[PDB]
Each structure stands twice: as C-alpha cells, then as structure tokens.
Write a protein that binds this ligand. Sequence first.
Ligand SMILES: [Zn+2]
Ligand SMILES: [Zn+2]
Lengths: 550, 340, 126, 170
Amino acid sequence: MAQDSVDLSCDYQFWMQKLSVWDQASTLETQQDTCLHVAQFQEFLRKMYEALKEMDSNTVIERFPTIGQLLAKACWNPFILAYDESQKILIWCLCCLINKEPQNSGQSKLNSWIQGVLSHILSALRFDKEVALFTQGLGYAPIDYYPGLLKNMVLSLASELRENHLNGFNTQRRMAPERVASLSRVCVPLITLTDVDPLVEALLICHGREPQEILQPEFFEAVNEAILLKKISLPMSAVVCLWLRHLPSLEKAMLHLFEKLISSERNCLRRIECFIKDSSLPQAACHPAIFRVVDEMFRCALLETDGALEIIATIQVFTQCFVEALEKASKQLRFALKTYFPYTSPSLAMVLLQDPQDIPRGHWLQTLKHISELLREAVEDQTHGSCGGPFESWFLFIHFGGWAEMVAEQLLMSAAEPPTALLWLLAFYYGPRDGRQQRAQTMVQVKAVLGHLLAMSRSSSLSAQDLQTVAGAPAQQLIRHLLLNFLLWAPGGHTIAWDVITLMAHTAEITHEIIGFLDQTLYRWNRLGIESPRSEKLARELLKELRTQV
Amino acid sequence: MESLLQHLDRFSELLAVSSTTYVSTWDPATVRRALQWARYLRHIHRRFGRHGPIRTALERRLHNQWRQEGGFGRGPVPGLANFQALGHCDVLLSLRLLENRALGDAARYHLVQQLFPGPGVRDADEETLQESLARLARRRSAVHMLRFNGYRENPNLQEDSLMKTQAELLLERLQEVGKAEAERPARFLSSLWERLPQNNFLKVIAVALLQPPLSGEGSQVLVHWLLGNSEVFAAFCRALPAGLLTLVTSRHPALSPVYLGLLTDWGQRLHYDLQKGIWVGTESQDVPWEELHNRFQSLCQAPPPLKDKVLTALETCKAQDGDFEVPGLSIWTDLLLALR
Amino acid sequence: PTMLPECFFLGADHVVKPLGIKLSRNIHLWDPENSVLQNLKDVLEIDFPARAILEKSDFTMDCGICYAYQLDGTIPDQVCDNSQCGQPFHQICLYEWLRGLLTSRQSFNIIFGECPYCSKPITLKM
Amino acid sequence: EGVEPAPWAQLEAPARLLLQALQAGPEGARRGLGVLRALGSRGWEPFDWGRLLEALCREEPVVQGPDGRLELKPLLLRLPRICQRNLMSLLMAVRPSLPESGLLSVLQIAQQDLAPDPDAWLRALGELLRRDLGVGTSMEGASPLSERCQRQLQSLCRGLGLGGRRLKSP
Ligand SMILES: [Zn+2]
Ligand SMILES: [Zn+2]
C-alpha cells in the first residue's frame, strides 16, 4: 500500500513516448531498439494488466487518457506482438476496457475501436494481394493455410542460407549480407515459436566466409538465454558453434552454472550432474578452445574463494562428464592431454585419468602412493621442464575426484603406521604454497591425531569432548574433515555423530560446508559402487536433519 | 454415426450464418451453445478422426455440402474447408463473430470473456481457446515479418515459397475432388479459371505441375485439362518464363509436341525486314524475336530426351520452307544459326 | 623421455578394455631407469610384433576430408583417379568441398573439380 | 563485381589445404590434425610452419569503415572468422614445434591493440597462447575473459564461504 501510481505513471510516459518513436519498425534502428527493450515492455504490461483488472472500465479515468494510443502503437508494431506473451496481455487489456452496456457514445466508439484493433491483431489481410485472391476461390480461410505457408517460408529461407554456405569463394549469387542480418533480427522476438526453429539451426551452422560478424549480438544472446532455460531445444552442433563464435555468450552460460551451484542447488550433486549432462558443456568442451575458457572461469572462482569445497565438487563433476565425452566421441585424431591441461607434466594427468572403478578397492593405496611420489617431485623439486609452481599441480589434482577424497579413508584403512607419502598428499591437498616447515608440522600433528583416532576407534563408543581435546587454527578444516570421515567410517559412529556435529557446526558456513562434504561423499560412493550401508543410512539421516538448520 | 449428421450440418449452418450481418437476435445463450457444439467437434476430430469409416463418412458429407453450394452466386461462404479444419472449427467461428459488427454488446462481452478469461486458468489439460488465439497471432506476425525483412521473390518459381504453398492447396483440392468423384476435375478447373485472376492462376499451375506426390494423380489431371483447353495453353506458354517451361516439358513428355507446335506457329507468322536486321511480326501481340529465341534456347539447353525432339522439329520446319543456308529468308535458318 | 608417456588405444572395444585394465593395474610399476619398450612390455604385460605386416599396413581408407569411416551409412567410395593419391572420399564431404572451390563447374548430375590432396581432375556423379 | 578469390589462393598448396580444412565449422580444428598427419604421410614429411607463419602476417589492402578508407590488414584478420578461431586453436595444440619469432608476430596481430570492435575470441586466444609460452605473462590484467564477466563472477563468489586453503601468495 505504498506507490500504486507513481513509478507506473512515469513508466507510462516513458513507454508511450517510446512507442511513438518506434511504431512498426520499418527501418533498421527501430528494429534493433525494439528487440532490446521489449522484455521490460512485457513486464510493464503485466503490471498494467494487474492495475486495470482489479478496477473496472468506463467509470474511472485514471490513465484512460492515453491507454488507447498506447495499445494501438503496441499492436501495429510486430516485433512487440510476436514476443512471448505480449499479445495475450494486450488482448486482456482491451478486454478490460470493453463494456457490456454502453450508455454514452464514447463507450460504444471505444468498443468498436476495440473490435477493430483486435481484428487487426487476429484477422487482417495485410499480406500480398494475389495470394489472398487465390485462396478465396479455393475456399480456404487464413487459419488453415497460415501454418503451412510459414513452414514453407521458413524452409525456403533455410535453404538459401545453406546454399550461401557452400558457395564459399564461388562466382555466383552471393546472398546479400544485409538480408542475413535482417533474418537474424527477425528470428529474435519469436524464438519460442516452434515454427522457426529450423531457421535458427541453419543460421548458426551457416557461418559464412565474411570475416566480420554478420549477425548482431542481440541475436546471440537471445539464443543463448533460450538454450539455458530449455525454451528452444536446438541440436548440439548449433549450440557448439554459437559458443565458438561468441565468447561472451559462453561466459554468460558458464555463469548461469555458477548460479546453479551457489544459489539454487547448493550441494545436491545429483541435480548438478543432471544439469551438466543435459546442458551441452561437456560435449562442447571437447573443443580445446572452449575448455581453455571454461577452465579459466573455474580458476577465477577457485582464487576468489581460497579453495571453497563447493567449487571443487562442481569441478570434479564437470571433469567426470567431460572425460567420458572426450573418450566417447573422438576415435582417431583426438587432441593430446597437454592441450587441455598444458601446464603440468602430461605423465601426471595420464595417471590421474585412470578411473578407480577400474581398480580393485585394495590396490587404491598403491596408486595413491605412486601419485604422491610424482606430485612431490613436481612441486618440491621445482626445476626447469616442470609445472609453473605448486598451485598449478594442485589445480590439476583438484580436477579428478575419486582420487582426492579416497585419501583420508585409505589412511584410516591403514591407520596403523600411516605412510608419510599419503600424509604428504593429504597435507598438500588442504594447503599448498606452505613450505616444508609448515607441511612437516601439519603432517606430524596429523600423525599424532591419527594415533589418537586409532586408539579411540579400537576403544569403545566414547564421548565427543575427548574429540574436542585433540581438535583444540590454520589446520582445523583438515582435522574436521578427517574426523567426519572417521565418524562415517568407524562402526563406533552412528551413536555419537550428533554430539560432534552440533559442536563443530558453530556457524552456518561450517554447517553448509559439512553438508557439501557429505553430499560429495555419497555421490562419490554411489558412483564408485563402494558402500557400507551403515555409513549410507547414517549420512542420509544426518544430511536430512542438517538440511533443516541451514 | 447418424448422431453426428444432425450435429455437423447444424454447426455448418450456424457457422455459415455467423459471418452474415443478420446478427441481432444472438445472445450469450446462442454463443455458449455454439462453443459447446464446437468443443464436441474438436473432441471428435481428436478421438476417432483417423483411419475409419467415420472420417470418410464425414468427408463425404462435407464435400457434398461444398459442392451443392459450389461457391457461386448466393454466397461464396468458405465453411470449414476440410476434415482437418474440424480440429479448429471453434477458432473460425470466434474470428467470424469478432468480424461481425452487428453483434450485440452483451453477446460480444460474454464471448470475449469466454475466449479471454485471463491467466486465472493458466493450468489446463487441453490446449484451450485463449492459447490457440495467441498462437495464431504469433504466426500471423511471423509471416508478415518474414515477407518484409527476409523474403525474396525467387526467379525459379518452383522453388519460391508463396507459390509453392498455393500449389499444394490446389493439389489438395484436386485430390479431394478425385476421391469424391461427384463432378469431374475439368469442371472445377473451368470454374476456377473464370472466377479469379488468370495470370496468377497460371503461374500457380506451372508450379503445381512439378510438386512430387504427397499420398502423380494431381499433375496427371492437370495435363489432361490443359490439353483439352487450348486457349489457356495459348496464354500459358505465352506468359511464363523459359526455364520453367523447359523443366515442365522434360517432366511431362505429353506437353512437348503441342508446345513446339505453338512455337512453330509463332515463327511462321513473322516476316523479315531488310532495313533493320531483325525478324519482326506484323501485329504487336506476335511474340518478338527475342522471346522466341529465349524459349528455344531454354528448350535446347535441356536433357537429351527433349533436345533431339525440339532440334528435329526445327530442322523439319526449315527444310519445309526451302533449304536456304543464309539469313533473311527463313526464321528457321536464323534460329539454327543463333544456336551455334 | 624415459618418464611415463601418454598412451591410449585405438581399435576393437572388446580387445582394448582388458588392456586398459591391465595398464591401470601396472602403471605403478613404470620405471624411468629402463627403456620405454622395456617398461611398456612389463606394464601392459604383453609383447609386440616386430613388423607383423610390412607390406599391407593400414592404408588409411577414410574420407580424407572428414577422416571417418562410416559417415551416415555411406562408405568411402568416391576415389581419386591417381596412382599417387588413390584417396577415397564420401559423396557428401566431397560434394560440399567441390561446390566450394572456384575452379569447379557443374554439369547436370556431375561436378568436375580438383582432388583436395593432389589437385588432379576428379569427377563426382550424384 | 562480387566475385572474391579466396585469400589463401596464392600460398603453397599444403597451407591452402590446411586453411581450407579448418573452414568447416567447429569440427574444423580436429581436421587440421588429420591434415598434418596426412602430410607427414606424403612426400614432404616435415611441414614448413615458418613460411605459413610469415605468410599469415603479410598485408594487403582493404576498404572499410565509412566507404572509402584504405587500410592494411594482415592475412590472419582477413580469412574467414571460423578459420581464424580454429587456426589459433590448432596452434595452441601444436605450440612446441613452432618457431617463436613467427608465433610472436602473430600474437602481436592478435592482441589488436586500439582496434575498435575487436574479435573477442582472437584476443582471448592471443592471451591463452601468450600464457602458454610464458613470455606473455605480460605484467597486465590481461585475462582471457572480459572485465564484465570477471566482475559479475567476483560478485557471485562473494556469496560463498571463503576457504581455509592458501592459494594466493604474498
Ligand atoms: Zn566423408
Ligand atoms: Zn588425389
């Protein structure tokens, strides 16, 4: 109960003076301008609809001054009347202004004018003359040929574009580049019209030989947006070529993935996996150009946070999807891995690509122990002919889930006399760029902590305070996560998990982090097919209750 | 089956009078009854509209309706044109009522309220009437925009996009009359030829003669109609461009010999004047040298089944008029020379 | 060089899989003090042929435009009329290529043009 | 009037074939590798990159902007826009076996300093190629991305709990 007129009475004058500037978009500049502003116009009309619906016609005169001129100007512009719902709302506004029982001649004139403009929308013969004449003879109404004609109109145009593509450097008939840009502007307001989809796919695949961009960026954005909300459903080759010709559209698409992992679906990796596979990014990222730019936006996010676990998991999912699509669809002549991951020793990647589904559960220790050795070489023995640094070898290692998370659980499986190389790998995970004094201090703390935990596990089901003693910093998240892995692993868990979780969940950030952790872990288990049903049911119940605290 | 006859004919009568300017007595009661009937028909088309005696029975009823009316004199009312239009009969009626100025105010209001309740019923199982009319406005605007921003009149008419839709309409109208078998296609074509603009019709015919079948009974009927009626074929081969008629003739060998007779006759009614080095006709409507050269050049630049035929038809007309070997004496010599 | 190489497998999906598995199991056994061959042989746990066929190597029988066998049912059928090329093609790839070049001219169902690899007269009948 | 010859017309045939191959859309890049192996196969087993990387910088004239304005464009900006982005992709793929002096002249073109209406993909592949030499650290805010996306991505990462890891170094 605050404004009710003011913002709207301003927007009214803005839009009315703009419609007056526009009307019918018979030029270039009116067209580009309409296609831009149209989306807001739609919202303006929804608000206007709400306003006129709640009240009634012919009695009140609030904005009845120029509502007529506004709706007319709107209707004769066809880039407005072809956008998503504009027409349906414009009908509604005129249905409200009608009157059942006119008294003064103004109400009758209004109703007549309304019938006139509605008829112009629905049923006016502004089309070619001879084609109109031909049909009446055969006894056809507009409706029962409009569809085929459109269909047959579209296919024509698509062929011409198809032919212009093959005539690259040929003495004939060059499709005038003005018309290609024109079509690109005309497809934009009506992308959610199913009858035109054939035209889009042809425009995107038929790039042409012209070195300048012949399509205008209002077109790329509309297609891109519409692929991501699933309102157009193109085929994959079209979206890959859109990504490859308009890099700011690939940024706006990969940001729309980061909103998916930050806002809507935090730490539900099944909905992220579903989204990524359904989106085409994995299929598109088989192209080295797109994987270097998609990977660069992940790095920017990896640095802005100082190693957020939520980003890491998304990267792991993405990389797992990407792998079985690089594999799936490049039999002979595929790109060499130093071309996607160009900084590290290729050796290392070649190791980390090997899926742990393929390996027996018992031989994971050997493989990790080897990887650790080669990673230690690549970071600490930083000589020429190697990585750029520790961060880069880290950023690689992060891409491959499976390996990075099984580490603690293998230390617990070999908790008696932990191997120092695994301790090294784990300490390296939670912090690189530390220096040996830090890494050593962390490792010896961790070894002492593991000494405490093996003793506590082989003991009975004990309290949570005994755990806060050893927990009691820069090395907290490592110990926290190791202790959570201990809870899920040890059969002493499922009794005292809550006692530790409540105390550990100081803030909301640690809670969210632990939720993420547990989701990642169950995703990882269900993927690798490694499971103890105690931990599965335990983690599911804990996750259920922690999703309530938020 | 019999239950549907009195329904469908009644609906067709109500629809036909809908467009007519007698609308005074109409009310929300009439319109509601109309739209509920239309709902029933739209449901029928959906339920058991394919592959049965019911579909064909209804087609029989419809086409008999459209031929007892015919479309001459008392009213050229469309009516619902064909079985597919049952699936959108309700839209047609509504559009007609919006066009009838004589509609009363309370009727119009109830109507528009039943088409456009608002987004109160955004969730609906059956694609309702409001969505249908919005989707119609969308298509209409899309068609206008393509025409005025992308579309170009292709020269090879067969591949153009307006003509190719007209063609397929005509072809559907021949197939329906063939299956009906009530009156012969020749009658339909003759009636068409008088009513509507002829040059347009002819362009259309050319392209309809080339569309592949969609079941070649369509083309097979038109060749017979044309060979029956010479005057049109006189204006046919006179109006179209060259390459089109070349593709026509290679497609239909039945059209080759007569067309050559037509050309041969236009040659024989030219005379050469020595002062300007050009064959000319006496009368103005006799095809000039250039057009006749064009057509023969198109005919000769064709598949070999026609090349030998036209070439032999020309040589026999040369030798017929004295076997001269020098220009100024025989149009047929000047053609055979202007080919090498 | 002596360090582990990038290696992967082309061929029959049923033959390669056990090889990938065996590789996965033995990759820890790689050692950059021996030779590449002397490491690979005990890693993949198999021996090599020393030139099993020297004459009839896999003469690449792929499109030489799209580099695939089996493009949409079609086979590499259209070939080069040349002893030094002999390169097969597909109808579709080789049609879209020849319709591009400036030199090419089209009769009724025929296009004459230059073979992409050797630039000799090649004919394509649709 | 409107016949244009292909701008790679005058080059040694092998380069002509490579550039012809890359033209063919996004699967354009892959094809390039098949082309290079299919010329390792033929009589000239080595492929003389140094000449293609010279020829890619050579300039010719064009008339763009208003109607009349003479400008000199090197080859790399004059050949079709999907060939550009799949060339630079295939150089990213085979960087190690290229002479650096030529490569640098190309990147020098790619950077497109003070051009208005640049080709964002050419610039970003410039920068990612520089980064792969390492001689193009550049001491800049020279990132592959736009400033606009990086700002909205900072804007987004802020709504997430920063981690106990230490990756950025003083
Ligand atoms: Zn092929
Ligand atoms: Zn060859």
